[PDB]
A paper describes a structure:
In the current model, the E3 Ub ligase RNF168 recognizes these polyubiquitylated proteins and then ubiquitylates histone H2A, which serves as a recruitment signal for 53BP114–19. Recognition of ubiquitylated products by RNF168 relies on three distinct UBDs: MIU (motif interacting with Ub) 1, MIU2 and UMI (Ub-interacting motif [UIM]- and MIU-related UBD). Currently, it is postulated that UDM1 and UDM2 interact with different ubiquitylated targets: UDM1 is associated with RNF8-dependent polyubiquitylated targets, whereas UDM2 recognizes RNF168-dependent monoubiquitylated targets. In UDM1 and UDM2ΔC, the simultaneous interactions with Ubdist and Ubprox provide the specificity for K63 chains.
Numbering used by the authors:
A (entry chain A): 111 to 191
B (entry chain D): 1 to 75
C (entry chain B): 1 to 76
Protein backbone atom coordinates (compact mmCIF):
# COMPACT_ATOMS: atom_id res chain seq x y z
CA UNK A 1 0.00 0.00 0.00
CA UNK A 2 1.21 3.45 -1.00
CA UNK A 3 1.10 5.13 2.46
CA UNK A 4 3.48 2.35 3.55
CA UNK A 5 6.35 3.28 1.26
CA UNK A 6 5.33 6.96 1.42
CA UNK A 7 5.31 6.68 5.22
CA UNK A 8 9.08 6.66 5.68
CA UNK A 9 9.47 9.72 3.47
CA UNK A 10 6.59 11.82 4.81
CA UNK A 11 5.66 10.68 8.32
CA UNK A 12 8.10 12.89 10.21
CA UNK A 13 7.09 15.99 8.24
CA UNK A 14 3.38 15.28 8.75
CA UNK A 15 3.66 14.28 12.42
CA UNK A 16 5.14 17.73 13.14
CA UNK A 17 2.77 19.90 11.07
CA UNK A 18 0.26 20.62 13.84
CA UNK A 19 3.04 21.99 16.05
CA UNK A 20 4.56 24.03 13.22
CA UNK A 21 1.14 25.54 12.49
CA UNK A 22 0.50 26.44 16.13
CA UNK A 23 3.89 28.15 16.31
CA UNK A 24 3.19 30.39 13.33
CA UNK A 25 -0.36 31.05 14.56
CA UNK A 26 0.96 32.15 17.95
CA UNK A 27 3.70 34.27 16.40
CA UNK A 28 1.17 36.02 14.17
CA UNK A 29 -1.15 36.58 17.11
CA UNK A 30 1.66 37.97 19.25
CA UNK A 31 2.81 40.48 16.63
CA UNK A 32 -0.72 41.66 15.88
CA UNK A 33 -1.83 42.04 19.50
CA UNK A 34 1.33 44.00 20.33
CA UNK A 35 0.69 46.30 17.36
CA UNK A 36 -3.00 46.60 18.19
CA UNK A 37 -2.15 47.47 21.80
CA UNK A 38 0.04 50.33 20.57
CA UNK A 39 -2.73 51.32 18.15
CA UNK A 40 -5.48 51.55 20.76
CA UNK A 41 -3.28 53.32 23.31
CA UNK A 42 -1.88 55.86 20.84
CA UNK A 43 -5.34 56.51 19.38
CA UNK A 44 -6.96 56.96 22.80
CA UNK A 45 -4.23 59.29 24.08
CA UNK A 46 -4.23 61.52 21.00
CA UNK A 47 -8.02 61.79 21.14
CA UNK A 48 -7.67 62.92 24.75
CA UNK A 49 -5.02 65.47 23.77
CA UNK A 50 -7.23 66.87 21.01
CA UNK A 51 -10.21 67.26 23.34
CA UNK A 52 -7.96 69.07 25.80
CA UNK A 53 -6.75 71.42 23.07
CA UNK A 54 -10.38 72.28 22.33
CA UNK A 55 -11.05 72.84 26.04
CA UNK A 56 -8.22 75.34 26.39
CA UNK A 57 -9.17 77.01 23.10
CA UNK A 58 -12.68 77.58 24.44
CA UNK A 59 -11.26 78.96 27.69
CA UNK A 60 -8.91 81.23 25.74
CA UNK A 61 -12.00 82.42 23.87
CA UNK A 62 -13.95 83.22 27.04
CA UNK A 63 -11.05 85.26 28.41
CA UNK A 64 -10.88 87.33 25.22
CA UNK A 65 -14.66 87.71 25.18
CA UNK A 66 -14.55 88.96 28.77
CA UNK A 67 -11.89 91.56 28.02
CA UNK A 68 -13.78 92.67 24.92
CA UNK A 69 -16.92 92.98 27.05
CA UNK A 70 -14.96 95.00 29.59
CA UNK A 71 -13.74 97.43 26.92
CA UNK A 72 -17.19 97.74 25.35
CA UNK A 73 -18.70 98.30 28.79
CA UNK A 74 -16.39 101.23 29.53
CA UNK A 75 -16.81 102.74 26.06
CA UNK A 76 -20.59 102.58 25.82
CA UNK A 77 -21.14 103.71 29.42
CA UNK A 78 -18.80 106.70 29.08
CA UNK A 79 -20.81 107.76 26.02
CA UNK A 80 -24.26 107.71 27.62
CA UNK A 81 -23.22 109.20 30.99
CA UNK B 1 -30.47 73.07 25.51
CA UNK B 2 -28.49 75.15 28.00
CA UNK B 3 -26.17 78.12 27.54
CA UNK B 4 -24.56 80.45 30.05
CA UNK B 5 -24.45 84.25 30.22
CA UNK B 6 -21.64 85.63 32.37
CA UNK B 7 -21.96 89.24 33.51
CA UNK B 8 -18.91 91.39 34.17
CA UNK B 9 -19.75 91.38 37.89
CA UNK B 10 -18.94 87.65 37.99
CA UNK B 11 -22.58 86.54 38.05
CA UNK B 12 -23.50 83.60 35.81
CA UNK B 13 -26.98 83.33 34.30
CA UNK B 14 -28.24 80.01 32.96
CA UNK B 15 -30.77 79.96 30.12
CA UNK B 16 -32.80 77.32 28.32
CA UNK B 17 -32.60 78.00 24.59
CA UNK B 18 -33.07 76.40 21.19
CA UNK B 19 -30.43 76.73 18.44
CA UNK B 20 -33.09 78.54 16.39
CA UNK B 21 -33.74 81.12 19.11
CA UNK B 22 -32.67 84.60 18.09
CA UNK B 23 -30.56 87.00 20.11
CA UNK B 24 -33.76 88.94 20.74
CA UNK B 25 -35.28 85.86 22.38
CA UNK B 26 -32.12 85.37 24.43
CA UNK B 27 -32.40 88.95 25.67
CA UNK B 28 -36.05 88.31 26.53
CA UNK B 29 -35.09 85.22 28.53
CA UNK B 30 -32.47 87.26 30.41
CA UNK B 31 -35.17 89.85 31.07
CA UNK B 32 -37.50 87.28 32.65
CA UNK B 33 -34.83 85.83 34.94
CA UNK B 34 -33.06 89.07 35.88
CA UNK B 35 -35.38 91.98 35.04
CA UNK B 36 -32.87 93.73 32.77
CA UNK B 37 -34.53 95.39 29.75
CA UNK B 38 -33.32 94.06 26.39
CA UNK B 39 -32.24 97.52 25.27
CA UNK B 40 -29.74 97.57 28.15
CA UNK B 41 -28.15 94.27 27.10
CA UNK B 42 -25.20 93.72 24.78
CA UNK B 43 -24.03 90.13 24.29
CA UNK B 44 -20.53 89.14 23.19
CA UNK B 45 -19.44 85.74 21.92
CA UNK B 46 -16.29 84.80 19.98
CA UNK B 47 -15.07 88.39 19.83
CA UNK B 48 -18.30 89.56 18.21
CA UNK B 49 -21.27 91.69 19.21
CA UNK B 50 -24.39 89.62 18.62
CA UNK B 51 -27.16 91.07 16.46
CA UNK B 52 -30.76 90.83 17.64
CA UNK B 53 -31.97 89.24 14.41
CA UNK B 54 -29.60 86.32 13.94
CA UNK B 55 -30.05 82.99 15.72
CA UNK B 56 -27.72 81.10 18.05
CA UNK B 57 -26.80 78.60 15.33
CA UNK B 58 -25.94 81.55 13.08
CA UNK B 59 -23.13 82.31 15.54
CA UNK B 60 -22.26 78.61 16.03
CA UNK B 61 -23.40 78.82 19.66
CA UNK B 62 -23.77 75.25 20.89
CA UNK B 63 -24.75 73.83 24.25
CA UNK B 64 -22.80 74.84 27.36
CA UNK B 65 -21.46 77.87 25.49
CA UNK B 66 -20.77 80.99 27.56
CA UNK B 67 -21.88 84.45 26.44
CA UNK B 68 -20.76 87.71 28.04
CA UNK B 69 -23.30 90.38 28.97
CA UNK B 70 -22.69 94.14 29.05
CA UNK B 71 -25.10 96.23 31.11
CA UNK B 72 -26.04 99.87 31.59
CA UNK B 73 -24.36 101.48 34.62
CA UNK B 74 -26.15 104.55 35.97
CA UNK B 75 -23.37 105.23 38.46
CA UNK C 1 -10.58 28.42 1.76
CA UNK C 2 -11.72 29.48 5.23
CA UNK C 3 -10.16 32.19 7.39
CA UNK C 4 -10.98 33.51 10.85
CA UNK C 5 -11.36 37.13 12.01
CA UNK C 6 -10.81 37.91 15.69
CA UNK C 7 -12.70 40.98 16.89
CA UNK C 8 -11.78 43.31 19.74
CA UNK C 9 -14.01 41.49 22.25
CA UNK C 10 -12.80 38.00 21.27
CA UNK C 11 -15.50 36.93 18.80
CA UNK C 12 -14.53 35.00 15.68
CA UNK C 13 -16.02 35.71 12.26
CA UNK C 14 -15.78 32.90 9.72
CA UNK C 15 -15.33 33.76 6.06
CA UNK C 16 -15.04 31.79 2.84
CA UNK C 17 -12.33 33.47 0.76
CA UNK C 18 -9.82 32.85 -2.02
CA UNK C 19 -6.10 33.71 -2.08
CA UNK C 20 -7.00 36.15 -4.85
CA UNK C 21 -9.63 38.15 -2.96
CA UNK C 22 -8.60 41.66 -1.97
CA UNK C 23 -8.89 43.25 1.46
CA UNK C 24 -11.89 45.11 0.02
CA UNK C 25 -13.72 41.84 -0.70
CA UNK C 26 -12.89 40.58 2.78
CA UNK C 27 -14.37 43.69 4.39
CA UNK C 28 -17.40 43.44 2.10
CA UNK C 29 -17.87 39.84 3.24
CA UNK C 30 -17.57 40.97 6.86
CA UNK C 31 -20.28 43.53 6.07
CA UNK C 32 -22.59 40.89 4.59
CA UNK C 33 -22.07 38.65 7.62
CA UNK C 34 -21.83 41.13 10.50
CA UNK C 35 -23.46 44.30 9.14
CA UNK C 36 -20.32 46.37 9.76
CA UNK C 37 -19.61 49.06 7.13
CA UNK C 38 -16.24 48.49 5.45
CA UNK C 39 -15.13 52.07 6.12
CA UNK C 40 -15.22 51.33 9.86
CA UNK C 41 -12.99 48.26 9.48
CA UNK C 42 -9.25 47.93 10.05
CA UNK C 43 -7.80 44.47 9.38
CA UNK C 44 -4.45 43.53 10.94
CA UNK C 45 -2.32 40.52 10.04
CA UNK C 46 1.16 39.67 11.34
CA UNK C 47 1.23 43.06 13.04
CA UNK C 48 0.51 45.23 9.99
CA UNK C 49 -2.63 46.94 8.79
CA UNK C 50 -3.81 45.51 5.49
CA UNK C 51 -4.43 47.74 2.48
CA UNK C 52 -7.74 47.49 0.64
CA UNK C 53 -6.17 46.82 -2.76
CA UNK C 54 -3.74 44.03 -1.93
CA UNK C 55 -4.76 40.37 -1.80
CA UNK C 56 -4.61 37.68 0.85
CA UNK C 57 -1.96 36.11 -1.38
CA UNK C 58 0.06 39.34 -1.21
CA UNK C 59 0.08 39.12 2.59
CA UNK C 60 0.81 35.36 2.81
CA UNK C 61 -2.64 34.83 4.33
CA UNK C 62 -3.27 31.11 3.97
CA UNK C 63 -6.07 28.69 4.77
CA UNK C 64 -7.34 28.90 8.37
CA UNK C 65 -5.21 31.96 9.13
CA UNK C 66 -6.55 34.47 11.65
CA UNK C 67 -6.98 38.16 10.84
CA UNK C 68 -7.63 40.76 13.52
CA UNK C 69 -10.45 43.30 13.19
CA UNK C 70 -10.28 46.69 14.93
CA UNK C 71 -12.98 49.23 14.18
CA UNK C 72 -12.29 52.94 13.90
CA UNK C 73 -13.56 55.53 16.35
CA UNK C 74 -16.75 57.35 15.43
CA UNK C 75 -14.90 60.66 15.48
CA UNK C 76 -11.18 60.29 14.93
Amino acid sequence: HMPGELRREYEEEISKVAAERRASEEEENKASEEYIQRLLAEEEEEEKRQAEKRRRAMEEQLKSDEELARKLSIDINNFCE
Amino acid sequence: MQIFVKTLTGKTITLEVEPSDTIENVKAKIQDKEGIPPDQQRLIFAGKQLEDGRTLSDYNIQKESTLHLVLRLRG
